[PDB]
Structures are given as C-alpha cells and as structure tokens.
RNA sequence: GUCGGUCCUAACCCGACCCGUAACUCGGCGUCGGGGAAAGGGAAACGGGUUUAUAUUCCCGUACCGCGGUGGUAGGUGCGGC
RNA sequence: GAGUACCGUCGGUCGGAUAUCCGGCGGGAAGCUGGGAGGCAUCGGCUCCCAACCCUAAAUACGUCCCGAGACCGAUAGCGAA
RNA sequence: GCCCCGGCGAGGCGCAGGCAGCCGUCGAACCGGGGAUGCCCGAAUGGGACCUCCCGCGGCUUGCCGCACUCCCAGUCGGGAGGGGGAACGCGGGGAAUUGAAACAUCUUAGUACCCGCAGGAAAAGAAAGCAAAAGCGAUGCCGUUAGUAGGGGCGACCGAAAGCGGCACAGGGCAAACUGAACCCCGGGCCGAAAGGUUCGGGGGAUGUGGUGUUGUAGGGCCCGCGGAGGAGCCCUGGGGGC
C-alpha cells in the first residue's frame, strides 16, 4: 500500500529497536553511573537519514 | 555433554542428537516468553561442540 | 611477389632442387640457415644456394643475390620455407640452404646451374 | 534450507491462541531467509503432520512470522500441548 | 654473418631498398590499430642487441604515435603573460617512452624491456616494443633475464627505468653538467631537465 | 496464483571494442550488448462476516487465469446458406 | 651497440654565463688505418677515456605500530577527543 | 564464542559495584602456538541494480562444483598472471595565484599548493666515451666544510652550485658480436632419491639461431701456433655438537 523497499524496511526496523531507555538493573549494577546514552531519538525532533 | 563422550560415538548418533537439541532449544525459547536460566546458553554451546567434532571426524 | 625475387622459376626445377638437398644430406654436406649459408658464400665454399619465397621480413635474405653474383655462385628460388626445412632434415623450417660437397647429386647441380643462367640472362 | 534449522520460536499470544483453537493454525517465528516450501518441510518433518497452507509476513522488528494451517485430519492443539503451552 | 647487412640497410632507408618496402608497409600499418602484437621483429639485429631471444615468454608489439608537440588547454582563470602560452610546447617525455607506456597499458601482466624505431610518416612514428612474461618457467630458468621477476621491477616503464626513460632523465651524462640529475630529479628539487 | 513491483519500450544513461589526451576516476564514439515509467503499454476475484488493532490478503459462499495430467469427442477422413 | 654522436633552429628548464640539462622539427657520420672530452669557435700539440644494452648488498629516509625516557601539560591546560 | 597441544595453579562468567543461575581439580579462567566456523555489500568477478536486494545457466548426486574482463603458455583440454587497499618516507609526469620588489610587465612567490600515473619495506643511484692539470685520483649513495663563494639577475629585489679536503660504509658481475651449429630449454606422466637433481615415454618451443665461447683502450677478445690439463666451489640434510 505504501511501497517500501525491503532493505530500507530492515534499516528502519533496527532504528526502531535501538530506541529505548537504559535498563534499571544496569544502573544498579553500575552504582548510578550509566543512566543515559546518546541515541534517544523522537520522531518529531530529530530526523534520521532514511 | 563433554567431548570425550562425544568422541566415542558415530556420526549418526551425533546427527540424531543435534536434531533433538535444536527442538529443545526452540521449545525453551518459546516458554522463556511465558529455574536454570542458562539452559539456552548451554544447549547452544553443546550444538557447537557436536558440529566441530563431526567436521573433524569427516575431514579424516 | 617480394622485391628480392629476380626471376620466376618453374616447378620442375624446384622439384629438382629439393631432391638435390635431400640427397646431399643423406650423402654429402649441407649448411642450414641464412647465417651458416651467408658465411659459406663470403668464404667461397658453396656450389648452390637455395632460397625460399615465403620470407617476411625480407631483410633477412635480401642481401644474398647481389652477394652471389659477385662471387659468381648460382642460386634458385623455392616457394616454401617449411618444405625447404624438412628436406634438409629439420623439424623446423629454413629460409636458406647451401649445397657444399655434393655427393651423388653432382649432375643435378650442374644442370640446375645452367637452366637458371638463361632465366637470369 | 535444512529442516531443523528453520524454526526459531513458537508464538503464544492472544491472536495466536485464538487461531489455534478456531482455525487449526499454528504460528512460528522463522529464519528470514526461508521460503514457504522450506517452512512446510520443516514443520512436517519436525512434528510429523501434514500441512495445508502457509502464509508469511516480515515484521518491523525484522523477524519473519509464519502462519501454518494443517489438514483437518490433525489437530493443532495436540502439537500445541507437545510444545510448552 | 647476416646481421651486419641488416644494420647497413637500415642505417639510411632512403639510400636502400628499405624505403619502398616501408612506403607499402605504412600504407598497411595506417589501417591497423594503435597497438598490435606481431610474430617476428622487423629489425632483428637491433632487437637481439637490446635483448631478444626466440623463446616462450618474449612478445613483440608495434605502436603508432602522432608526431609533433603538444597544445595546452585554455586557462580559465587569470594568468600572467609569461603563463599564457598554448601552442608552442613540447613534452618532457619522448615519443618512444609515450609509445612504451601505451603498450604497457594494453598488456597488464607483462614487463617492458626495450624498444626501437621502425619508421616515420609525416603524421606518425612507429616503434616496436619488447615485452617479457615474468611468471613463465623458461624465463624463471634463464639467468640473463630471471632478475625481472623481482619485487622492485614492476611498473618499470612508468617509473623511468627503461633506457628511453633514462635518456629523458639525463642519466647518460656523468660529470660536468650532470650535477642535478643524480640520484633523482626529485632529489634536486626538480631542477634538472 | 487474481491488488502493486519482478515483463516492454520512450526521452535519456552506461560498459566493451575503437579514437583522442603527458596521463586519468577526463573527453568522445557508429556498432554490439545492457539498463531506464509503483499515474504510459501490460494474464486472471466478487459479495458478506470476523479482530483491541489486518483484510478484494483470514473465514463462508460462489468464480476466474497459467502450467501439467487423466478420460471422452469435433476433426484428420463434416456441413447449412445465391 | 645508428635516425645514435654531431650541426641548425623553436619551446621549456638551469648558477651555467657566446660555456647546464630535457623535448619537438629539418639535416645527418665514422665505425679499429676507428671514435670521444679538456667552460666562445676553429688549427696544432699533450693529458685522460671507449657512449648509444642489463643486474647489484652496506653505509641513508619514514614511523598509520611497539619499547624506553622527560628543567614538557595537569581537566578553559594537554591531541579535537583523560 | 567451538577443538587440540604446552604453561600457570583455583577460581572464573568484557567496560560494569544487580537478580537468578552455570562452568571449573577428568587441571578452567588467563598466557604461547596451532586448527574449525566465518551472513550481505564491497576490486566484487555467472547476469542485473531508484534503495547492502533480486534473477539465472549447466553438469554430479535436496545436497554440490563450475560459468566475469584484459593478457601469457597453449589448444579445441586445460595451467597461470593482473585489477583493490596502505599515515609518513620513494620514483616519473602536469602545473597556479595571493605575496615581495614599498606601483608594475622581466624577475619573485615556485618546479611550491594542488592534479595524474607507478613501487617497496625501504626506494632511487651505481662500476668512468668521468675528475683533473706539469702532481696525480679511481663505482654509487650519506654527513661536515668548501660558500652566501664562482656565477645568474629591470646587474634591481633577490637567487645560487660543484670539484677538492676531513669522515661513515665498501664489491663488483653479465649480454650483443666475431667463432661453433642442435651438443639446448619448458610441461606431463613411468621410475631413484633427504636432496641437491638424474633417467625414460608423450607433448610445446627453437636454423628469422636454443645452448657453448666471450665482455675490453691503441687495447680486449676471437681465430692461429703451441707447452700445460687442482673449478671445486656450492648445494640436500639419515647423522652431530655448540649458541642465540
């Protein structure tokens, strides 16, 4: 219906999975050092390279 | 699973065993989504051990 | 025809001459090759020079006719290099051959000599 | 593709369970590089059943989902019980 | 024998039988392609003196090049007047070396040994180029050429180690006058030649 | 399998051979081949229901296309009309 | 060991100046009773050499890497980046 | 993260201070050496790319190998080479303007920046058709001086060497031809061997010259007379000791 190419689809799927917050057990294991990482992307703010 | 126990046997038993282990791995990965949370890792590594030893038996 | 050919010989000679070459091998003495032949003329040992016509580049055999006339040694042409080599006992071809010390083929030579003298003059 | 290398997971969701008990259908997560022939053979050799229909889709997590309809001589619920669920 | 007479015939073509043969040959060579492999050399004395043997691995090629100098493309930005010339320029490589590079470009697995002049037109010059296969066993066995399979000898013609390149680099002079050609042109700030 | 892409060519583009250039990842080139349209040309499916979220894609009903078989027949060796 | 040595002319280049090297165009040898150089050309002496074919280590340059050391900086410094 | 051989000697499971668990004394983790697996694109090479995905040929038995372009050897079988990458250093070509000259045109900036091509762990050079001058030296390359000198130059601004001398390091060999004329080289198979390499059948080259000879200054070589016939230095490692 909207007609994507398969490889573009797979790249968009990876970009989708990448986008979540740090797990809680990681903060605990690290003693509150790793609490945010450089790739939180929102679909209205920062656009990807298609 | 240990390589000495894997080296006593024939390629056909090795094949039967890989089939069985792959079926177990699929079932476990299905329930995991629902007591030893390392079953998946040890099954993986066992399949690998079997494949290595089968290849080295053939190359002979 | 190339420019180093100065007359057109008929087949029967060429047929006579190959024999003379084949013969003098089985019996007498033969020089094979333009270098071996050219030295035999410069020295005065040859009774007959035999020359092919399928030679390219012409540079290789273009110096013989004028060099023979000087030393007054006769020469006849043949059409093939590959036959001229086989007759002389070679797996490879040859562009020039010289008869020296002819044995059992004397009175072919002296006849081949006469027919080509008028065919030159 | 080699059978016994095709299937990765069974799915157990509301949709999948509904299909099990309404349309005699199973639902598997499968290798991306597999075709419908391969999927059919995998299922038939791993579970000793006969297959009627296979349909496929690629998800937006990058995985291949297969819907498999068995012939009515076999029940999907017995194989479902043979699996964890 | 037989080599001096070739030498003497080619020492001045006009004055011998080679002139007419070359006229006909040129008629034909003008039809041929720019680079063409041939079976036997045209000048055997000169080839065997520059190194040519009748064995497997030796290849002979004829190359045609256009005569004269070069014309520069038009400058698009501003130039000073000493920097404006277009028409009266000559290449610092010779036409021989240019021909060798063309042949090398068309035979990518071989190496150039040397070359010799084989004729001239009003529009064209013709050179013959000798090439060697370094990875052939005859070559790897004959110790007069077997050096040519070493590491330091690929791209020979492109780096200027053939005799035409040496001449154009000025390496046929040794003493007074040659101060700025050794060991390289780059070594003396490009100031030689 | 039936919707669109996977076929065809358009204007146009590219490679090889060939020619030029001190040379090239540069400039050309008739021919040979290859590409180039999700609104041009171009085989075949409709209605109703079902889900929290898909449906001419699942289910029910009733259809069509291509390929490949099986078995019969028209015909090969048959007719009606100025 | 020939379109070579050499002459003339044009363009570039060099500290090379009437005496640097490179290339193009027009001419063009001797060749062992032979040939070349000696800072304008030429003549005669004397001195030194044999081009136009090929290979060749060591002493030298560099550090995208590794090792050691330091009157170097010490988180706005120090590599842009602890 | 899988296997093996050695070492170490009890804990281990990356940055990374968690919940559950597992591996290890049948020698792990870790260290040294060696193997296996190794998706797609990419020189990208069976054929095509508006989306790192698609579409085929064969032949053997799904499971398997092969199928690009340019060239060499060949030859209707096959055996080989090249392509791309690399900080700085290296070789060969093409080649500006700002600027200074207190303007500017010869000059300078500069054979610089940048562009094109070609190699390696180093590259390039290299064994006098030389340097010198009443004496002599003796292949190349690098260091210090020669020297801001000879010399170039709107003789302006500016540019700019070498020989020699003192040192580091050392090394010299081969073709073409004359004379000889197949006495020669390569590939495969049958044998012998640790091997240097011999010997046999079948093929490819080669008289348009394979191999032998021979490589220099009034000289060297060839041929020609002759007396002499220490090529024996290298290579293979059943053996062997030492040392790193």
Swiss-Prot record, chain A:
Keywords: Ribonucleoprotein, Ribosomal protein. GO terms for molecular function: structural constituent of ribosome. Gene3D superfamilies: Ribosomal protein L39e. GO terms for biological process: translation. It holds the Pfam family Ribosomal_L39. InterPro entries: Ribosomal_eL39, Ribosomal_eL39_CS, Ribosomal_eL39_dom_sf. PROSITE patterns: RIBOSOMAL_L39E. One of its GO terms (cellular component) is cytosolic large ribosomal subunit. Belongs to the eukaryotic ribosomal protein eL39 family. Part of the 50S ribosomal subunit. NCBIfam families: PRK01242.1. This is Large ribosomal subunit protein eL39. The lineage of its organism: Archaea, Methanobacteriati, Methanobacteriota, Thermococci, Thermococcales.
Swiss-Prot record, chain B:
It holds the Pfam family Ribosomal_L29. One of its GO terms (cellular component) is ribonucleoprotein complex. It comes from the Archaea. Keywords: Ribonucleoprotein, Ribosomal protein. GO terms for molecular function: structural constituent of ribosome. One of its GO terms (biological process) is translation. NCBIfam families: L29. Belongs to the universal ribosomal protein uL29 family. Part of the 50S ribosomal subunit. This is Large ribosomal subunit protein uL29. It comes from Thermococcus kodakarensis (strain ATCC BAA-918 / JCM 12380 / KOD1) (Pyrococcus kodakaraensis (strain KOD1)).
Curated annotation (Swiss-Prot), chain D:
Pfam families: Ribosomal_L23. This is Large ribosomal subunit protein uL23. The keyword Calcium does not apply. Belongs to the universal ribosomal protein uL23 family. One of its GO terms (biological process) is translation. Keywords: Ribonucleoprotein, Ribosomal protein, RNA-binding, rRNA-binding. One of its GO terms (molecular function) is rRNA binding. It comes from the Archaea. One of its GO terms (cellular component) is cytosolic large ribosomal subunit. The gene is rpl23. PROSITE patterns: RIBOSOMAL_L23. InterPro entries: Nucleotide-bd_a/b_plait_sf, Ribosomal_uL23, Ribosomal_uL23-like, Ribosomal_uL23/eL15/eS24_sf, Ribosomal_uL23_CS. Binds to 23S rRNA. One of the proteins that surrounds the polypeptide exit tunnel on the outside of the ribosome. Part of the 50S ribosomal subunit. Contacts protein L29. The keyword GTP-binding does not apply.
Swiss-Prot record, chain E:
It comes from the Archaea. Residues 183-193 have a biased composition (Basic residues). Pfam families: Ribosomal_L15e. Residues 167-193 are annotated as: Disordered. One of its GO terms (biological process) is cytoplasmic translation. GO terms for molecular function: RNA binding; structural constituent of ribosome. The keyword Ribosomal protein applies. Keywords: Ribonucleoprotein, Ribosomal protein. GO terms for cellular component: cytosolic large ribosomal subunit. Part of the 50S ribosomal subunit. Belongs to the eukaryotic ribosomal protein eL15 family. This is Large ribosomal subunit protein eL15. It comes from Thermococcus kodakarensis (strain ATCC BAA-918 / JCM 12380 / KOD1) (Pyrococcus kodakaraensis (strain KOD1)). The lineage of its organism: Archaea, Methanobacteriati, Methanobacteriota, Thermococci, Thermococcales. The gene is rpl15e.
